[PDB]
Design a protein around this ligand. Structure first.
Ligand SMILES: CCCCCCCCCCCCO[C@@H]1O[C@H](CO)[C@@H](O[C@H]2O[C@H](CO)[C@H](O)[C@H](O)[C@H]2O)[C@@H](O)[C@H]1O
Lengths: 1042, 161, 107, 268, 54, 54, 54
């Protein structure tokens, strides 16, 4: 600690070494939007095409929830059963649990119910997926002259692009807007009734006709002696064209005229599915929704993907151009750019304050050079803890400037003043100051770290931000302190010009130095005030109590939050058509939206991506989605040109004047936020009740959740309402006479109105699927039931209308289950400033009116937020108590920490006063800002107090006189640190740009808190020290040794 | 069958279990097609049951299978999602549709157990249906709805008929 | 020597009778297709024999936990498992942590 | 597999099935007149063998009353084989194979001797539908980084310096159609990340060394005076390496470093 | 384990029919409670006795 | 590996029929032993030579 | 169990079930005439039941 101050080149060696180790450790370091924050979840999915809700829930879903018995670290399970047949059983796990292993046990708990599953599922994919919820990027492919259509682009994508542009690492899961080409065979019921044939006959046909077949080899092992030929018999070979599929033999008519598939059915090389239409600005397109993986890099994935794609350009067909719509990537780059800019601005402004106080360049350089080595060095500490340069860390350094410049400035200041107090050379002055603030600086390190550590030990996303922050600034802090012991004093003893006793530069300089005079005089004025208030202390205690009360009040009536909403240059709109609506109408809506955006928002909107058939609440014709990109912020001024007001007027235009509900908005900051001051209600069936039983329970509950003026009214579920289900009872009796086979009756019903996965062919080299289905018109309105005939055992055709009792009913298409039993979800919240737990109490008390078999539950965010909460203030209480004790450690008093901590309110009331003035919220950033503020305020108070104590104890000076003198000597430094800090964090507070809401959210609180902290404590700390000290032994009061 | 594999002490249970099971999902078609649907379980497991919770009815009004039913219907499906559990053994058993054939009455009507098998098989099942306005529909179409097909049974009645 | 060489896992499947181009473009490339985001990947090489038996090798960075590497990759292939013929899955398909050199041969 | 390297030819633009192969033939043929550089260079892959196609005609079979399932299954079970069930030999469960015999599945004419019992009871010959012919087909289809490609194995003449043989394999490639390229795998992949890592190691290490010496000492001159000694230890390692005839490998680089070590000690 | 299992069961408790009562035959739980309670007792005993000697 | 393999074989050794003998043609195992023997020997020699110089 | 063990007697060359079972009879009966070495040597498992071939 002291040994370093005489070996200066050793010090600079440590300096430059860790500064260049810094820079080196700054180059190849990961960069992302946020760190890997959100909890990991894994999902099982199985495809049973055609099958209904009650079918897939009770043939695939339940058998999965029955054979998912033995997973470790399991939190909760939530399973979907779409009317489309696709099951979605998502298990979300304990945070930090190894995702890969959880997914693996789960997947090997999935292959227990595999032969028990339908044979159409068994070959059409069962998937286990580690899964997030938000796409990193969506890469669209289009054709400008409109040469090809959606399905074509989808084909080229799935054939040459959806695996070559991805030879760039960092992608987790793609959802294709479109579908792969299949061999689409469309059956004519009239042309197939004609020849006395059934869909089944087509099945067996294309099955046994089209295949690759096990052959053998000439000279097969083991051959016999003398044999000198070995070669491989080629057998039957799979198909290739739409041509080769028509000319397959179904039957031969007696006269010789053949019956080919070409006859009974129309054949096109067509996609495997036509459920979702991906329309890009009218122009036909096909897209890739690339989900980001749990723990994947951001900017290198996108750089190498765009490089790979631009290098995959020499494989491009007619007019096939690439578009890059949904991109959350350049937002990150520009964000980091502006944060770095903030750093530079803060640094330079601090430099300017430093010069406009010390007025000589080579002294300004002393704390100046101190800054790169603490920052860069912290990066080296960051590069060693295995985290990443995101927003939070860089913001941590932005705040750290204050702390590091605090320690450095304090050192340099005390040195400069000591030279004005004794006259000794640089070295001796240095040792004096260091000897005065040694235990002090160690202590401040201890306490600052004692406010940052208990925020590192809390869980959740707030705790992740807290981790990034704490690590950043604490590391920076330890660095600044060890710099104070090693780097700052070595710098003081050397480059610093020497000053003899009592200069102070009063009136000595023409341009700059006049300030000193104005400054110096005021200091004495200031001191005359301090004594003045120590003269009569009482009134200031009352005023203190007042200030405290104001702090409490202002704190209570302050809006809580989690994170700020972010204009990311990219937002989206969601579309919903009512029960049992049609693809056509939703297409109308999407094109209408796409018109509005590229019409009345031309200067703002750059590209719309209308994806119909794909929502969030469910899959279906009812729902649609449209992505919206906006050009670079450089061309977007104003208030109405920003995401919020845009979605405001968008929802304005798309609610009051439309037939169905359609809402436009912006994605949250993370990728899956805590569900605000509200919740995600899981209503669960237990005693095995109906679907209309549960639906009716939801009706009663949601009706109760509309019967208060003190909570909400007409709240809503996020999920599809009951769709019309069309029951077709085959009467077994009326069928078993006519000699028709139920297997065939069913299979024909399916293959007509559902579809069939039968075989695989070889398109251009790539294996694709073979599909047989009805045709466009012969499977629409219900009367088409009849038009399909079953060929009986001999050769007589029976109509479906001979047994098909037809009717209407209701059934919800989105069938949810929670922990092995039927359940239904209800999104919801609480009145604007209601505590969520209170809403919990009201909803549970409204769910205390349910029939055995109907219960309540909490899921997702509001699950982890349910049994954990009211201990955070206890943890911060721990922060202040630990700070208390630690100060008592470096000091040695169960009383002086009282005197310094009493100053803490004076720092909070200013963050609050700043929060209300501009209008923010007690979120994460404001809480960190609060903490920091408490920290620095406590620092300044700590040092003033320290000098008062040291004078009192080691020079025999009395209380009052020494408080006055300590006040005198350590005022200027307080103002140096303070002013440099406020002027350093100012660039944050008032800025507009990528994520500037974050900047303002930290900035505001930090600044205001600091203002009140200094410009009240510098009048309050002495009274604290005085009245606190008057409770420890009578004799002595005013000591005297020599 | 009960195949117990013991490993070197301190070895990570999960990876060993899966890797073993991913050598088990190699000999799965090699297993009878009648076994493959009758349950294969790979379990990280102690050797002694930790705790046993029994349920009774003092009055008399029910037997093993009933209590066991409510158990296996509402309870013995969650105690394996309470992490730290390897395998629960129900002292009892879950409800099934138990059909017991009369052999003289099966000789009587010229039938075999096989015919009963095929019967209840092809009679009781869910079958791939479709939708009115099936995707992709044609222009002008303004109705989309879900075809219900044959629906599995429920009672002792629906099994008699 | 120490555990120097990169860790690789290999899939092998019996596809009887079929020729080279049949098994390569139905099994081989089709395995590596849902593998876009493999961690610690050095280089990748997969073969398709005329005996119908495929040899799909995924190689990783050295010192990467073999068990864990196998977990991420085998769980990047068992995304592309129905993509392989369901007609092969009857005579055993094996995923094995595997080198290329015999430790010892005892005759 | 081969000591030295595994010269890897990679497909990039998807340029053919034997076209790329012809480029490789051009490559190995261009590099075949140098025995004063390399030795025992060889191609890695089975070349295209003659393939024997036997098309069944569906019509001419569906007339005679034979079942396609049965005709195929019989062709297979005859000249291929069948795995049907398992038996229990001496206590251990083993597999059951049924196939043709040593004499009925050799030369192609044995195609005929197999008859399918039709739906009624008449045996139909293979010559009723089996059009037979010859083709070309490679039996080994291997791929590298997701596409078919084939490499070139090799070694070098006694006095085995690896870098000269690698560099030479690259040097006869100065008459090749770029769009057909080179890359590395196996040994000389690791020997690739060994060497061209010298500037990173020496730049970080030696400068860090400069400052590190500068630490306990107090002059921007003394680290100069010490680091100036390092070459004098190197020139002798080199002079020893060439005279006996070795190579700049790993062991020689570690040796170099150690030598630098002792020299730096003495100077220090 | 017993917390999550007994909680798991206790949520299935407000759905229990007529006279359907629970019994606990194989229980390794309260034995722990009394054991640790007595160990703490031992700790206290050591403290106070040591104090007495002191 | 070779020791436990030698165990694997030697426990299967009392079950060997007429003339059923084992051969070791491909062995990368004893080479390790003899290599390490010569390297360690070299180390020791360096030590002793240092002693002699001293 | 402190004193005690778990003897797994293994058939290797494949000689049968009554070969090994009779071997176990010989061993367990002969190792019952040593009280000065072992104790309570026993089979833990159901003995061969009569199986009814149809
Ligand atoms: C850089 C810009 C300058 C920064 C600091 C400038 C400080 C300017 C302080 C001027 C205000 C005077 O400060 C205020 O008035 C006098 C000071 O004597 C004090 O009040 C005192 O007045 C007289 C002094 O004998 C009486 O003793 C009285 O009982 C006592 O309360 C305090 O009430 C003090 O709060």
């Amino acid at each position: 600690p002291n040994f370093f101050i005489d070996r200066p080149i050793f010090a600079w060696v440590i300096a430059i070494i860790i500064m260049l180790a810094g820079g080196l450790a700054i180059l190849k370091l990961p960069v992302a939007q946020y760190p890997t924050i959100a909890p990991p979840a894994v999902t099982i999915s199985a495809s049973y095409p055609g099958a209904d809700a009650k079918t897939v829930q009770d043939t695939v879903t339940q058998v999965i929830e029955q054979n998912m018995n033995g997973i470790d670290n399991l939190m909760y399970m939530s399973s979907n059963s779409d009317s489309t047949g696709t099951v979605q059983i998502t298990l979300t796990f304990e945070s930090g649990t190894d995702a890969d292993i959880a997914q693996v046990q789960v997947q090997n708990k999935l292959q227990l119910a595999m032969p028990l599953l339908p044979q159409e599922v068994q070959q059409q994919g069962v998937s286990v997926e580690k899964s997030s919820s938000s796409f990193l990027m969506v890469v669209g492919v289009i054709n400008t002259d409109g040469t090809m259509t959606q399905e074509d682009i989808s084909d080229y994508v799935a054939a040459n692009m959806k695996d070559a542009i991805s030879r760039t690492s960092g992608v987790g899961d793609v959802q294709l807007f479109g579908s792969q080409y299949a061999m689409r065979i469309w059956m004519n019921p009239n042309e197939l009734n004609k020849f006395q044939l059934t869909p089944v006959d087509v099945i067996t046909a294309i099955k046994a006709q089209n295949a690759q077949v096990a052959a053998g080899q000439l000279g097969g092992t083991p051959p016999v002696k003398g044999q000198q030929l070995n070669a491989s018999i080629i057998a039957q070979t799979r198909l290739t064209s739409t041509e080769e599929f028509g000319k397959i033999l179904l039957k031969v008519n007696q006269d010789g005229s053949r019956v080919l598939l070409r006859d009974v059915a129309k054949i096109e090389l067509g996609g495997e599915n036509y459920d979702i239409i991906a329309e890009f600005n009218g122009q036909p397109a096909s897209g890739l929704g690339i989900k980001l993986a749990t723990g994947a890099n951001a900017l290198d994935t996108a750089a190498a993907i765009r490089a790979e794609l631009a290098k995959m350009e020499p494989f491009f067909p007619s007019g096939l151009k690439i578009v890059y719509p949904y991109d959350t990537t350049p937002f990150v780059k520009i964000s980091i750019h502006e944060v770095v800019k903030t750093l530079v601005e803060a640094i330079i402004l601090v430099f300017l304050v430093m010069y406009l106080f010390l007025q000589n360049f080579r002294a300004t350089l002393i704390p100046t050079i101190a800054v790169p080595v603490v920052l860069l060095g912290t990066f080296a500490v960051l590069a060693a803890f295995g985290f990443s340069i995101n927003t939070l860390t860089m913001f941590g350094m932005v705040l750290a400037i204050g702390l590091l410049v605090d320690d450095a400035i304090v050192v340099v200041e005390n040195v400069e003043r000591v030279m004005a107090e004794e006259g000794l050379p640089p070295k001796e002055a240095t040792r004096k100051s260091m000897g005065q603030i040694q235990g002090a600086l160690v202590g401040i390190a201890m306490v600052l770290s004692a406010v940052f550590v208990p925020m590192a030990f809390f869980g959740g996303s707030t705790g992740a931000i807290y981790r990034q922050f704490s690590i950043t600034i604490v590391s920076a802090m330890a660095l600044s302190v060890l710099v104070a012991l090693i780097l700052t004093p070595a710098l003081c003893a050397t480059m610093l010009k020497p000053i003899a006793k009592g200069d102070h530069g009063e009136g000595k300089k023409g341009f700059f130095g006049w300030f000193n005079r104005m400054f110096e005089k005021s200091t004495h004025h200031y001191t005359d005030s301090v004594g003045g208030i120590l003269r009569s202390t009482g009134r200031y205690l009352v005023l203190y109590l007042i200030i405290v009360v104001g702090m409490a009040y202002l704190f209570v009536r302050l809006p809580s939050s989690f994170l700020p909403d972010e204009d990311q240059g990219v937002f989206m709109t969601m579309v919903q058509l009512p029960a049992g609506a049609t693809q056509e109408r939703t297409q109308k809506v999407l094109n209408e939206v796409t018109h509005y955006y590229l019409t009345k928002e031309k200067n703002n909107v750059e590209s719309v991506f209308a994806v119909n058939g794909f929502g969030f609440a469910g899959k279906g014709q009812n729902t649609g989605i449209a992505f919206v990109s906006l050009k670079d912020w450089a061309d977007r001024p104003g208030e109405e040109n920003k995401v919020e007001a845009i979605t405001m007027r968008a929802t304005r235009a798309f609610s009051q004047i439309k037939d169905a509900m359609v809402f436009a908005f912006n994605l949250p900051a993370i990728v899956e936020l805590g569900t605000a001051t509200g919740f995600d209600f899981e209503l669960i069936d237990q005693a095995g009740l109906g679907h209309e039983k549960l639906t009716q329970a939801r009706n009663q509950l949601l009706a109760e959740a509309a019967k208060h003026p003190d909570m909400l009214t007409s709240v809503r579920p996020n999920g599809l309402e009951d769709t019309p289900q069309f029951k077709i009872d085959i009467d077994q009796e009326k069928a078993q006479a006519l000699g028709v086979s139920i297997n065939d009756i069913n299979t024909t019903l399916g293959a007509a109105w559902g579809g069939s996965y039968v075989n695989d062919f070889i398109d251009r080299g790539r294996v694709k699927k073979v599909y047989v289905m009805s045709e466009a018109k012969y499977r629409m309105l219900p009367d088409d039931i009849g038009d399909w005939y079953v060929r009986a055992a001999d050769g007589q055709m029976v109509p479906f209308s001979a047994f098909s009792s037809s009717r209407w009913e209701y059934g919800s298409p989105r069938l949810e289950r929670y922990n092995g039993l039927p359940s239904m979800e209800i999104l919801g919240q609480a009145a604007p400033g209601k505590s969520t737990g209170e809403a919990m109490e009201l909803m549970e008390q409204l769910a205390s009116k349910l029939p055995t078999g109907v219960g309540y539950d909490w899921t997702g965010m509001s699950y982890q937020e349910r049994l954990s909460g009211n201990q955070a203030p206890s943890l911060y209480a721990i922060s202040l108590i630990v700070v208390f004790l630690c100060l008592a450690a470096l000091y040695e008093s169960w009383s002086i920490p009282f005197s310094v901590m009493l100053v803490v309110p004076l720092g909070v009331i200013g963050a609050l006063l700043a929060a209300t003035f501009r209008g923010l919220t007690n979120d994460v950033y404001f809480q960190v800002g609060l903490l920091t503020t408490i920290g620095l305020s406590a620092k300044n108070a700590i040092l003033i107090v320290e000098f008062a104590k040291d004078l009192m104890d080691k020079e025999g000076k009395g209380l009052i006189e020494a408080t006055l003198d300590a006040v005198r000597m350590r005022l200027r430094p307080i103002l140096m640190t303070s002013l440099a800090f406020i002027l350093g964090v100012m660039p944050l507070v008032i800025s507009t740009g990528a994520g500037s809401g974050a900047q303002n959210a930290v900035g505001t609180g930090v600044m205001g808190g600091m203002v009140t902290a200094t410009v009240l404590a510098i009048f309050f700390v002495p009274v604290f020290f005085v009245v606190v000290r008057r409770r420890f032994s009578r004799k002595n009061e005013d000591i005297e040794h020599s």
